[PDB]
Swiss-Prot record, chains A, B, C, D:
It comes from Rattus norvegicus (Rat). Homotetramer or heterotetramer of pore-forming glutamate receptor subunits. Tetramers may be formed by the dimerization of dimers. May interact with MPP4. Forms a ternary complex with GRIP1 and CSPG4. Interacts with ATAD1 in an ATP-dependent manner. ATAD1-catalyzed ATP hydrolysis disrupts binding to ATAD1 and to GRIP1 and leads to AMPAR complex disassembly. Interacts with GRIP2. Interacts with GRIP1. Interacts with NSF via its C-terminus. Interacts with CACNG2, PICK1 and GRIP2. Interacts with GRIA1 and SYNDIG1. Part of a complex containing GRIA2, NSF and NAPA and/or NAPB. Induction: Down-regulated in the pyramidal cell layer of CA1 in the hippocampus by global ischemia. Ionotropic glutamate receptor that functions as a ligand-gated cation channel, gated by L-glutamate and glutamatergic agonists such as alpha-amino-3-hydroxy-5-methyl-4-isoxazolepropionic acid (AMPA), quisqualic acid, and kainic acid. L-glutamate acts as an excitatory neurotransmitter at many synapses in the central nervous system and plays an important role in fast excitatory synaptic transmission. Detected in forebrain. Detected in dendrites of neuronal cells. Expressed in the pyramidal cell layers of CA1 and CA3 and in the granule cell layer of the dentate gyrus. The M4 transmembrane segment mediates tetramerization and is required for cell surface expression. Palmitoylated. Depalmitoylated upon L-glutamate stimulation. Belongs to the glutamate-gated ion channel (TC 1.A.10.1) family. GRIA2 subfamily. This is Glutamate receptor 2. The chain holds residues 25 to 400 of 883 of the full protein. Residues 1-376 are extracellular. Glycans are attached at residues 232, 346. The postsynaptic actions of L-glutamate are mediated by a variety of receptors that are named according to their selective agonists. This receptor binds AMPA (quisqualate) > L-glutamate > kainate. Disulfide bonds join 54-306. It is found in: Cell membrane; Postsynaptic cell membrane; Postsynaptic density membrane.
Length: 376, 376, 376, 376
C-alpha cells in the first residue's frame, strides 16, 4: 500500500524540505509508506499556487502540505473548502473558521498580550509587516482600547531595501521625541535582523530600550550582536532544546551533511521545520488510525480538474479531515491537539530573555493558564 | 466590427448592472459593437472567481470588467498580470503597482488626512471594517505618529446581525469613558446606515459630536434621519450632481423604469454605478482609438485555458493596457486619467457637510493641490 | 334563550372587533346566547351614527356597544337618555352625569396630577389634541391656578400629514427658547408615535428631558426607539400583564391567527380591546343576573323608530341600567364597579417608567388612595 | 309664489322670534312671500334637534334658520353637509370648514387679541364657559406662547348656581395672591351678570381692576351697577345705535307693544335679534337674486326622510348655498359679506369703554386693519 500527497515548498525552503524528508524517513512504516510529489514555486503567486494545486489534485492525492502567504491564503482556503481537500500548513493561521485546513502554527496574540501586561506596559510601539496579516495588530489595538494604552503603530514592509537605513534611522530618531524606549517587532527573520542591524548602527542597544520579538524563532536570528548592549530584549520560543525527543532529533540532525540534507548540519532548527516534522508525524498517525478503523478510501477514479463545473467533493475527504482533527501526540513543539476548525489547542510557548549568559527561559504560557514565572 | 468582453458582478449588483447596460447602449456606435459575457457569482469566493476568469478567457475576450474583494484581489491581480489580460474595476484600489489592472476608485487617504488636519483633530476614533482592507487605517496611524494624534481604532466587521444592536450600543457607551466626541466611519453604505441608526437610537446625533463618512457615497446613504440632530457631519462625493452631463444622465436615468433597469427610477446614484458608466466609456474610447491607430488585436487562435503550462500570454495585451492607461476623458466622477501603474490621477473629491437644509459642498481636494475651501 | 344587541365600530377597529368576538365566544354559555348586529361607520359622522342607532333600535335590541368621538358623544348621550337605551363604550368618558351610558375608560386627571406633583413640576408644557376633548387640559389649568405652575399648552390636532414634519420640529425648536425640558403628551397612539419619531429625529430623547404619555396605552406604543436615549419617560397602564387571568388571556390570544382574528397574534393588547373584552364580560354577567332574579325584559312589541313623536321609552330600560351599574367583577383592567352616573370607581392605574431593560411599574394610583409608590 | 322654510328657536328666545317676525313683515315683497314653520325646542337636545330637522325636511323646505349650542353644532353640520341643506344661524361660528352653513356672528379672537395687545397686557386671567366652545381659549393660549404671556385660565360653567357665590368669592380672593387685577370674561349675559354681581359683592369694582367682556352685547347687560366703581371696564359692540337705518329700526321697534311683539318695547336690542333681522334680509335677497337668475327650483316631489339610505341630495341646494354665499348688503351689523365656507368677512366691531358719562366708543376693528383709535 502507498499514498499520494503533495508538497508546496517555496523556492528557498531547503531546510524545511530537508526536515520533511527526515520525517518521511523516520516515521516511515512498511505498513503504509507515503509517496509525495513536491512542487516548488513562488508562494506569493496565486496563479502558480492554483496551477500546482490542480496538478496535485489531478494526480489523485488525498491530502496536501505546503506554505502560503497573505496573498494566497484565500485561494488555498477557497479551493480546499470547495473540493473538500485537507491542507496542512505551518504558515500563519487564518482569521476565520476555514475548514479543511490544519494550522500547526499556534496563536501568539494571547501570550504576547500576557507578556505585555506582565511587564506592566502602558505606552509602547508596534512595528508590523503585512507579510503575515494584521490579526496581531487588531488584537493589540482592541486590548489597548480595553486597557488605556498609547500604541504607536508603524509599518516597515512597504519600505524598500534601498531606503531602509535612511527610513529606519529616521523612525528611531523621531521616536525618542515621545520618550518611547519600549518597542515591539512583529516581523520575520530577515526584517528583524535588518532592524537589529539598524539598531546597532544607531547605537540604541543600550539599556532602557526594551525589545520584543513577536515570533517563535527567538533563537534562530542573529542575537549575539546585541546581547551585550544591556538592552531589555525578550522573545518567545516554541521548541525546547532541553527535552528528550527534541535532543535526540538534534543529535541525529546536526550529524547530517549539507549535501544530501541542506540546511541540516547545525545545532538549532527553525520552528517552521519543526512544525513540518510534526505535520509529517500527524499525517502518518491519521492515516494509520484510518487503516485501524477498517476503512478503504482509494479514489474510485481520476479525481478530475479544479474547473469541474459544478464542484465534485467526496465524503471520504471529510473523513480524512475528521481523522486529522482528532489527533493528540507529543512532537517537537509539544502537545498537538486540534479543534473543530483546525487551530491548535493546549500548547506551550516558552518565553525567553536575552541575558549576558545567553538566552534564558523565564516561564511559559498556555490557553488554560496565563503567563507563568519559573526562573526564580 | 464586434468585440467580446467579460463581466463579473456580485449577487446584488442590480444598480451596477443597470448602469453597465445604460452605458453600453449609450456609448455604442456602428464603429464597433461590444459583446459582453456576464457571469454573476460570490465575488468573495476565489474558486468561483477563477472559474469565471477561465471561462471568459477561453471565450476569447480582449478585456474584463468586474469587482473584487479582500479575498479575491490577489487572485485577480496574479491571473491578470500573468495572462496579460486587463481588468477594470471600481472596487478598492490595490496596495501596490499591479499591472493589467485599471483602478477606477481614486484614493482617499490624502483627502481624509487633509480634512482631519483642517478640522484640527488630535484625539478621535476610527471605526473600520475588513471589507476593503486596512490601508486607510495603516496610513492614518503612520501619519498620526508624525501628527501627534490619539486614535482609538475599532473593528465592526466581525459583528453578527443578531447581536449588532447590543454591540454597537456598547461601543459608544465605552467611548463616553474616553470622552470621544469625534469619530470616523470607514465602512460601506449598509454598515454606516446601521451605525447611524444605532447612534440616533442612543442619542449621539446631537450637537457636540462630529462624524466623517470615509467613503465617496456621502449622499448614497440616508441622512434625513440625522440631518436635524444638530451634530457635525462630513464626507466626500466624487460625483457633483450640479454639473451639465451628470444632470443630463440623471434626467435619462430617473425617467427609466425599475423593471428593465432596476435601481434606476431615482435621482441619486451610487459611485460604483457611476464608475461602471465611466468604465464603459473609457473602454469604448480605448477600442475606438486602437481601431483608429491602424492596429490589429484580433486573436489569431483561441485562448486555450488558464492552466496551460507554461503560461502563454498574447502580444496585444500590452498594447491594450497602454491604450486603457493612455486615456484622458471626463465623466461623472470627473476627469479620468491614469498612470503607468493604472491608478487614477488629476482627479477631484468634493468635500461635503450636512446642513439643516441640505448637504452642501464646502470645498474640494486634489492630488497636486491641497484641500481648497470654498467660503462663498 | 337568545338576546340581540348592537355594535358600532369605526373603520379600522380590527383588534377591537377581534377582542369582541373572543369575549363573545369565551363568556358564552347555554344559559343565554347573544345575537349582535354589527354596523361599521365613520364614528365622527353624527348622521351615520343616528342611522345606525335607529337601525339597531328598530331591530329590537336590549342594549348597545360602540365607540364615539367629540362630534358624536352628545348625539349618543341624548338618544340614549331619551329612549332609555343603555350604551357601553371604552371611549373617553363624558364631562357630566349622562344616564344610560356605561363608561369603561376610567378617569385620568387625578392620577396625572398626582404624578405631576410627585415629580414636583412647576414649569412645563402640555400637548393636547382635539380628539377626546379638553377636560384634562381644563383640569390641569384650574389646578395649576392653585398649585403655582407655569404651563405652555399647544395643540397638534389641526396639523396635516404633509407638513407634520416641519411643524413638529418647529414646536420643540420654539420650546428651547423657554427652556422647556419637561413635557406631557395627551394624544392618541399614532400621534404620540409621530411625536416621538420627530423627537428622536431632532435629538431630544437624550437625558435632561422628561416625557409623560397621558394615556393608558403606555406599552401600546413603540418605545424601543426611545428606550436607550437616556431621557426620563413615564406613563400609565390599566392592564397589568403580570397577572394570572390576563396572562392566560394573552396565552389564548397570541396563539390565535391573524386571519380570523386580525391584530391578535401578539403579546401586547390595546386597552380599548381590553375594555371591549371586559364590556362583553359585564354585559353577560348583567343579563345572567337579570334572568336569575326572576325577571322579564322581553319587549312585548316592536321598537318603532327614533322619531316617534312623542318619545316612548320602555320600562325595563331602567332595570337594565340598574343591572349594568350594579356589577362588581374583575377583568383585564382590574376591578369593575360603577356609580349611579355610570362611571367607574374603586379602580387602579399602574404608573410606569421606561428603563433601559424594560418598562417597570414604579407605583399605582387609586381613587380612595393617592399615588402609592413601590420602592421595592 | 311662496317658500317653505324652518325656524329652530329655543324656548325663551321671544325677542329673537319678535325680530324674526318684524323682518319677515318689513322685507315682505309680494313678488315672493315666505312661509316659515317655527319649531321651538330645547336646543341642547340633539334628539329633539334632529326631530325638528327631519320634520322641516319632510315638510319640503329649501333653507333652515335657527340656533345651536356646543352640544348640537356637530349634528347640525353633519345633517346639513350630508343632505345639502343650507342652515342659517347667528350662533357662535364653527371650528372648521363646515359647508351649507351661514354663520352670521363674526369672529372675535382677532379683535380681542388686538385690544389686548393695544392695552399692553402681559399677565392677566381668562374666565371661560363651554356654552360656546374653546376656540377663543385656544387662540389666547397660542398668542400667549407667541407673546410671552402669563394667562390664568379658569372655568366657571361647571360651577352650579347653588355654590356660585362661595366659589366665585373664593376665586376672586385667591386671585389677588398673584396680584392679578386685570381680568377677562368669556361668558354669556347670564354668567357675566352673575359675575358682576359677585364682583360688586366682594367690592372689587374699584379702579385698578380691568374687565373685558368677550361678547358683542356690551350694552345689553346690566352695567350701571358697576359704572361708578371707577373700574377699567371695556367691551365690544357690533351694532351702532347712531346710524340711519339702525336708528329708524329702533324707532319702529320701541313703539311696539310687548303683547304682539314680546321683548320689543325697548330702546336697545340684542345682537342675536339684530343678526336674525339681517338673516331674514339676506335670505330674502338670495331668493330674489335666484328669481332674477331665470331659474326654478321647486322640489320635484316630497323631499323624503333623514334616514333615507343612502343620502339623497339635490344640486339646486348647492345653487342656493352659492347664492347665499354671494350676498353683499348693509344691515344692522354693517357690511355682510361671506366667504366660500360661510364665515363673514369685511365687518366692523365697535369697541366700547364704560365711563362715568356712560359707554363711549373709542375705535373699531376689522379684518383688513388692526385696532383703530377714533375718540381723541
Ligand atoms: C528592564 O528590565 C528590568 C528587569 O530586569 C526592569 O527592572 C525593573 O523595572 C520595573 C518596571 O518599571 C520596576 O518596577 C517599578 O518601579 C517603578 C518606580 O516608579 C514603579 O512605578 C512601578 O510600578 C514598578 O513597581 C522595578 O523597580 C525595576 N527594578 C530593577 C531592579 O530594575 C526595568 O524596569 C526594565 N527597563 C525597561 C526600560 O523596560
Ligand atoms: C462642529 O463644527 C463647528 C464649526 O465647524 C466647530 O466650532 C468650532 O469649534 C472649535 C473648537 O471649539 C473652534 O476653534 C477654536 O476657536 C477659538 C475662537 O473661538 C480659538 O481661540 C481656538 O484656538 C480654536 O481655534 C472653531 O472656531 C469653531 N468654529 C466656528 C465656525 O465657530 C465645533 O467645535 C464642531 N464640533 C465638533 C464636536 O467637532
Ligand atoms: C429624571 O428623573 C431623575 C430621578 O427620577 C431626576 O433626578 C432628580 O432631579 C431632581 C432635580 O434635579 C432632584 O431633586 C432635588 O434633589 C436635591 C438633592 O440632590 C434636593 O436638594 C432638591 O431640593 C431637589 O429635591 C432629585 O433628587 C433627582 N432624583 C434622584 C433619584 O436623584 C431628574 O431631575 C429627572 N430629569 C428630568 C429632566 O426631569
Ligand atoms: C386703566 O386705564 C387707564 C387709562 O384710562 C390706564 O392709564 C395708564 O395706564 C398705562 C398702562 O400701564 C400707562 O402706561 C404706562 O406707564 C408705565 C409706568 O411704568 C409704563 O411701564 C408702561 O410701559 C406704560 O408706558 C399710563 O401711564 C397710565 N396713565 C394714566 C393717566 O393712567 C391705567 O393704567 C389702567 N389701569 C389698569 C389697572 O388697567
Ligand atoms: C494538554 O497537554 C498536556 C501535555 O503535557 C497533557 O498532559 C500530560 O500529557 C503528556 C503527553 O502529552 C503526558 O506525558 C503526561 O504524563 C501528562 N501529564 C502531565 C502531568 O504532564 C494534557 O493531558 C493535555 N490536556 C489538557 C486538558 O491539558
Ligand atoms: C487635469 O484635469 C483638468 C480638468 O479638471 C484638465 O484641464 C481642463 O482640461 C481642458 C481640456 O479638456 C482645458 O481646456 C482646461 O483648461 C483644463 N482646466 C484648466 C483649469 O485649465 C486636464 O486634464 C488637467 N489639467 C491640469 C492643469 O493638470
Ligand atoms: C375595591 O376593589 C377591590 C379589588 O381591588 C375589592 O376587594 C378585593 O375584593 C375581594 C373580593 O372579590 C376581597 O376578598 C378582597 O379582600 C378585596 N381586597 C382587599 C385588599 O381586601 C373590592 O371590590 C373593593 N375593596 C375595597 C376595600 O374597596
Ligand atoms: C367692505 O365694507 C365696506 C362697508 O363700508 C365697503 O365700503 C363702502 O361700502 C358701503 C356699503 O357697504 C358704501 O355705502 C360706501 O360708499 C363704501 N365706501 C366707503 C368709503 O364707505 C367696502 O366696499 C367693502 N369691501 C372692502 C374690500 O373693504
Amino acid at each position: 500500500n502507498s499514498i499520494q500527497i503533495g508538497g508546496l515548498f517555496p523556492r528557498g525552503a531547503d531546510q524545511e524540505y530537508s526536515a520533511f524528508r527526515v520525517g518521511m524517513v523516520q516515521f516511515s512504516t512498511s505498513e503504509f509508506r507515503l509517496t509525495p510529489h513536491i512542487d516548488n514555486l513562488e508562494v506569493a503567486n496565486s496563479f502558480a499556487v492554483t496551477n500546482a494545486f490542480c496538478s496535485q489534485f489531478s494526480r489523485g492525492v488525498y491530502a496536501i502540505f505546503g506554505f502560503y502567504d497573505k496573498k494566497s491564503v484565500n485561494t488555498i482556503t477557497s479551493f480546499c473548502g470547495t473540493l473538500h481537500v485537507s491542507f496542512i500548513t505551518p504558515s500563519f493561521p487564518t482569521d476565520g473558521t476555514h475548514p479543511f485546513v490544519i494550522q500547526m502554527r499556534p496563536d501568539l496574540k494571547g501570550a504576547l498580550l500576557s507578556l505585555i501586561e506582565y511587564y506592566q506596559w502602558d505606552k509602547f510601539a508596534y512595528l508590523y509587516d503585512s507579510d503575515r496579516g494584521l490579526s496581531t495588530l487588531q488584537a493589540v489595538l482592541d486590548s489597548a482600547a480595553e486597557k488605556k494604552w498609547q500604541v504607536t503603530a508603524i509599518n516597515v514592509g512597504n519600505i524598500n531595501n534601498d531606503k531602509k537605513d535612511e527610513t529606519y534611522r529616521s523612525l528611531f530618531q523621531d521616536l525618542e521625541l515621545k520618550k518611547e524606549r519600549r518597542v515591539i517587532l512583529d516581523c520575520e527573520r530577515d526584517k528583524v535582523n535588518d532592524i537589529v542591524d539598524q539598531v546597532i548602527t544607531i547605537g540604541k542597544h543600550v539599556k532602557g530600550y526594551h525589545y520584543i520579538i513577536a515570533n517563535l524563532g527567538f533563537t534562530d536570528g542573529d542575537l549575539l550582536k546585541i546581547q551585550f548592549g544591556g538592552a531589555n530584549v525578550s522573545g518567545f520560543q516554541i521548541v525546547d532544546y532541553d527535552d528528550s525527543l527534541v535532543s535526540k532529533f538534534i543529535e541525529r540532525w546536526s550529524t547530517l551533511e549539507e549535501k544530501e540534507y541542506p540546511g541540516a548540519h547545525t545545532a538549532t532548527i527553525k520552528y517552521t521545520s519543526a512544525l513540518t516534522y510534526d505535520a509529517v508525524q500527524v499525517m502518518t498517525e491519521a492515516f494509520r488510525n484510518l487503516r485501524k478503523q477498517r476503512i478503504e478510501i482509494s479514489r474510485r477514479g481520476n479525481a478530475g480538474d479544479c474547473l469541474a463545473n459544478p464542484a465534485v467533493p467526496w465524503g471520504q475527504g471529510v473523513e480524512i479531515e475528521r481523522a486529522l482533527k482528532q489527533v493528540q501526540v507529543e512532537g517537537l513543539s509539544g502537545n498537538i491537539k486540534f479543534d473543530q476548525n483546525g487551530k491548535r489547542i493546549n500548547y506551550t510557548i516558552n518565553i525567553m530573555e536575552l541575558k549576558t549568559n545567553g538566552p534564558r527561559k523565564i516561564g511559559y504560557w498556555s490557553e488554560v493558564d496565563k503567563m507563568v514565572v519559573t526562573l526564580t
